[PDB]
Amino acid sequence: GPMDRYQRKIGCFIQIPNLGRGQLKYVGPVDTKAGMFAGVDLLANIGKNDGSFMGKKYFQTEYPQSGLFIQLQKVASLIEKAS
């Protein structure tokens, strides 16, 4: 599947422009949103969530607002380069 190459990189770190270093924790759809998403933990409260959305847990965050869902297309090349 198209998400498999990104799913293999879960647990890696990427350097998201204008945000900072984030750990990739989830790749996939999000209920009620269009398209595929990367769930990242920014390891500081500069995200928007705790890894859950609409009462469902997608991933774990270190802090209450360190999690962020980003449209996968925006970070796909960064995730590919991560090792």
UniProtKB/Swiss-Prot annotation:
It comes from Saccharomyces cerevisiae (strain ATCC 204508 / S288c). It is found in: Cytoplasm, Cytoskeleton, Microtubule organizing center, Spindle pole body; Cytoplasm, Cytoskeleton, Spindle; Cytoplasm. Residues 28-71 form the CAP-Gly domain. The chain holds residues 1 to 81 of 440 of the full protein. Disulfide bonds: none annotated. It comes from the Eukaryota. This is Nuclear fusion protein BIK1. The gene is BIK1. Required for nuclear fusion, chromosome disjunction, and nuclear segregation during mitosis. Probably required for the formation or stabilization of microtubules during mitosis and for spindle pole body fusion during conjugation. Present with 300 molecules/cell in log phase SD medium.
